[PDB]
């Protein structure tokens, strides 16, 4: 497997912060982006359309068995944890139906666990606004493999819970307001 990957975790106010990130990335962004946004079943598709309409990158819902490619932003669908698997030098998504991690599924911790193991030091985690601690254990894995972690600054958060939890463990390499995140991503890849 070549290149890097960006895995974003978000909850409360997630869409608002993503609006300051995704639309500001070039069509030729070299790393595939995966977004795990906490939301009741049946709403993740609305998010895909919302972001696809304002972005140069192609935003869609992640599909089972689909190949993870650059130039795309994949939104995790409801009812399943979004996994990643490496096969013959390529990376594919898989819908896992194991227990809820928190009272949440998909949980960004599951996606990051899989992504980190595959991409290792080339893994980039972004933990945005939201309640709870989802993204913290996932950030641990990312750092354990030499990856990089970005936590959203309180300034642009609706709820400074998820990013704060990541920061308090010492897992954040960068603490940035949503609008500065796209710029940081562009220089890291």
Look at residue 172 and give its three-state secondary structure: coil
> Which residue in the block uniquely carries the two structure tokens 């609706």?
158
Q: What is the 3-state secondary structure (H, E, C) of 116-152?
A: HHHHHHHEEEEECCECCCCCHHHHHHHHHCCCEEEEE
Environment class of 21 (CB within 10 Å of its CB; exposed 0-12, middle 13-18, buried 19+): buried
Cα 2 to Cα 82: distance, rounded to the nearest angstrom:
20
User: Biggest alpha carbon distance in the chain?
Assistant: 43
Tell me the residue range of the domain where 117 lies: 1-189
Distance, C-alpha 90 to centroid of its chain = 19
Residues 6+ apart with CB under 8 A from 109: 9, 101, 134, 135, 136, 137, 138
DSSP symbol at 12: T
CB atoms within 10 A of CB 42: 10
For residue 5, the cross-strand partners are 123
Experimental method: X-ray
Q: Which residues are catalytic?
A: 11, 38, 134
The answer to whether residues 100 and 106 touch, using CB atoms and an 8 Å cutoff, is no
What is the rounded CA–CA span in Å between residue 54 and residue 77? 20
Q: Can you give the length of the chain in residues?
A: 189
**Under 8 Å between Cβ of 144 and 115:** no
Residues 6+ apart with CB under 8 A from 90: 1, 67, 68
Task: Please state at what angle helix 136-144 crosses helix 108-119, rounded to 10 degrees.
Answer: 10
Q: What does this entry list as its resolution, in Å? A: 2.2
Which helix (H) or strand (E) segment holds residue 182: the answer is helix 181-188
Query: Do 20 and 179 meet the contact criterion of CB atoms below 8 Å apart?
Result: yes
**Domain total of the chain:** 1
Q: Are β-strands 90-96 and 81-87 bridged in parallel, bridged antiparallel, or unpaired?
A: antiparallel
CATH of the domain at 124: 3.40.50.180
Residue with tokens 């809820």: 100
CA–CA separation, 35 and 47 (whole Å): 10
Q: What φ, ψ does residue 102 adopt, rounded to 5°?
A: 95, -140
């Amino acid at each position: 497997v070549s290149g890097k990957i960006v895995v974003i975790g978000s909850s409360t106010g997630g869409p608002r912060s993503l609006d300051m990130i995704i639309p500001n990335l070039p069509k030729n962004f070299p790393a595939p982006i995966v977004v795990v946004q906490h939301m009741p079943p049946g709403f993740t598709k609305s998010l895909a359309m919302r972001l696809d309409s304002t972005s140069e990158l192609t935003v869609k819902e992640a599909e089972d068995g689909e190949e993870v490619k650059p130039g795309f932003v994949y939104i995790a669908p409801g009812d399943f944890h979004l996994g990643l698997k490496a096969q013959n030098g390529k990376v594919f998504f898989f819908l896992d139906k194991s227990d809820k991690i928190n009272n949440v599924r998909p949980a960004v911790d599951f996606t990051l666990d899989k992504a980190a193991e595959i991409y290792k030091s080339k893994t980039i985690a972004v933990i945005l606004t939201g309640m709870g601690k989802d993204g913290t254990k996932g950030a641990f894995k990312v750092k354990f493999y030499g990856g990089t972690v970005i936590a959203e600054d309180k300034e642009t958060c609706v709820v400074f819970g998820m990013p704060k939890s990541v920061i308090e463990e010492g897992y954040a390499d960068y603490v940035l307001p949503a609008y500065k995140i796209p710029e940081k991503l562009i220089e890291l890849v």
